[PDB]
Amino acid sequence: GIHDTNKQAQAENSRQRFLKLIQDYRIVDSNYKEENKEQAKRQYMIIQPEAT
């Protein structure tokens, strides 16, 4: 699209949308990590089944 302003516009729109997609992915990942932490806290912060 370097020589046609319309093609450049199209490319930039694709870029924006793909960037939004990436952001969404990042968000999901972060949230899930944070949740996995709280569950891993839940399970072991208490007296445990009888010894090995």
Q: Which residues bind other proteins (CB under 8 A)?
A: 44, 47-48, 51
Q: Residue 2 or 51: which CB sits closer to other proteins? A: 51
Give the pair of three-digit tokens for residue 43: 């399970």
Nearest distance in Å: CB 47, other proteins: 8
Q: How far apart are CA 11 and CA 2, in angstroms?
A: 10
Q: Residue 2 or 47: which CB sits closer to other proteins? A: 47
24-40 CB burial, b ≥16 within 10 A, e <16: eeeeeeeeeeeeeeeee
Q: Residue 6 or 52: which CB sits closer to other proteins? A: 52
